[PDB]
Design a protein around this ligand. Structure first.
Ligand SMILES: Nc1ncnc2c1ncn2[C@@H]1O[C@H](CSCC[C@H](N)C(=O)O)[C@@H](O)[C@H]1O
Ligand SMILES: [Zn+2]
Lengths: 176, 19, 8, 157
């Protein structure tokens, strides 16, 4: 099955035995999923189980060289969506994108890598707009980065809580 | 080159041989 | 086509 | 020992036992950093495993970028390891006519790996070398050997 990675993870992240739930610890650190995609359209979900005061998350997609001891979006290897204010980040540049998200929200993550490349984020099933287009070529892994002790849970499919209207994709679980 | 630790199998594309 | 080999 | 066990040991230990440095043979080479006993695995010639039929297309692509060395290592008639853009320190192992290492294909979980083995006991400071066994080309593209062995055949081809 697709799961949060066993070794490809910042050691200070507290990952559950089932390897779908992760709690952050102190400054931003990151964990990638066990499987990544090079071509096609793919989708997964992340639920914010708990977001205490002064905690945050940057969620999205990472190539294998994205720095695990930095937020997602820190370098050229990843693209991320920040809980606080809905900012999107890439190479440590945050730009206007959506409204924030928080405790109880179910976030959706779409990427399309055709053999025109695109990353789109969803909030409780609703398209938040194209965040990045014509991204770097390579293998992209679902990825989670957390600031302090918030808790999120990832769902790779087959069944999503809020499957998007009129969007063609395969669930990340198909890579299993 | 990009450093690697293990072999990776190349995933050919459907059009791998086409003009 | 010029590659290293383990035997000729 | 089952070959997968000494193969993991290889992967866990190669970085500590070898290192990349300047070479008197040519440019950069791989050097022995701790004594290696005979028959032990030294390092894997790691890379992208490709079907043999893709070899020629990739070669002309690489010459269209100017890469002058061949980093492709044939496993058998059906497959080749391509270390031109992705690979490890085994890329830098030079050729010698009196080498102290040899290459050998091993089968691990239905996949083949090219592994370099110590032909004899190898001592710290020695440069690691093996016989490339390049196919013999015509004298328009002979490459002269600078391995320094007394039994040097004077080209890699
Ligand atoms: N015995 C030898 N004599 C002269 N050149 C050699 C050689 N063995 C290897 N080479 C050179 O090294 C290349 C193999 S890649 C080996 C690494 C290279 N020595 C470097 O400095 O980066 C070959 O293309 C060849 O030109
Ligand atoms: Zn020689």
């Amino acid at each position: 099955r697709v799961l949060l990675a066993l070794h490809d993870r910042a050691p200070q992240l507290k990952i559950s035995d089932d390897r779908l739930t992760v709690v952050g610890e102190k400054g931003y650190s990151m964990v990638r999923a066990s499987h990544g995609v090079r071509k096609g359209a793919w989708y997964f979900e992340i639920t914010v189980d708990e977001m205490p005061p002064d905690t945050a998350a940057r969620l999205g997609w990472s190539q294998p060289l994205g720095n695990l001891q930095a937020p997602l979006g820190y370098d050229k290897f990843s693209y991320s969506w920040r809980s606080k204010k809905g900012t999107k980040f890439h190479q440590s540049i945050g730009k206007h994108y959506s409204s924030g998200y928080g405790q109880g929200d179910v976030l959706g993550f779409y990427i399309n890598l055709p053999e025109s490349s695109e990353i789109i984020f969803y909030k409780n099933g609703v398209n938040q707009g194209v965040a990045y287009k014509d991204i770097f070529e390579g293998v992209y892994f679902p990825a989670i980065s957390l600031y302090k002790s918030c808790t999120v849970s990832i769902n790779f499919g087959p069944c999503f809580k809020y499957p998007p209207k009129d969007l063609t994709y395969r669930p990340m679980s198909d890579m299993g | 080159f990009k450093e690697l630790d293990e072999n990776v199998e190349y995933e050919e594309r459907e059009s791998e041989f086409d003009i | 086509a010029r590659t290293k080999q383990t035997a000729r | 020992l089952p070959m997968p066990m000494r193969f993991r040991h290889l992967k866990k230990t190669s970085k500590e036992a070898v290192g990349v440095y300047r070479s008197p043979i040519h440019g950069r080479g791989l050097f022995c950093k701790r004594n290696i006993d005979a028959g032990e695995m030294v390092i894997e010639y790691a890379g992208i495993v490709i079907r043999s039929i893709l070899t020629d297309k990739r070669e002309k692509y690489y010459d269209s970028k100017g890469i002058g060395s061949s980093y492709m290592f044939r496993i058998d008639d059906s497959e080749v390891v391509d270390a031109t853009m992705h690979g490890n320190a085994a890329r830098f192992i030079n050729h010698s006519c009196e080498p102290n290492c040899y290459s050998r294909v091993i089968n691990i979980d239905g996949q083949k790996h090219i592994v370099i083995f110590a032909m004899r006991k190898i001592y710290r400071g020695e440069e690691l070398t093996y016989d490339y066994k390049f196919p013999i080309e015509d004298a328009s593209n002979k490459l002269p050997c600078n391995c320094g062995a007394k039994k040097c055949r004077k080209f890699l081809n």
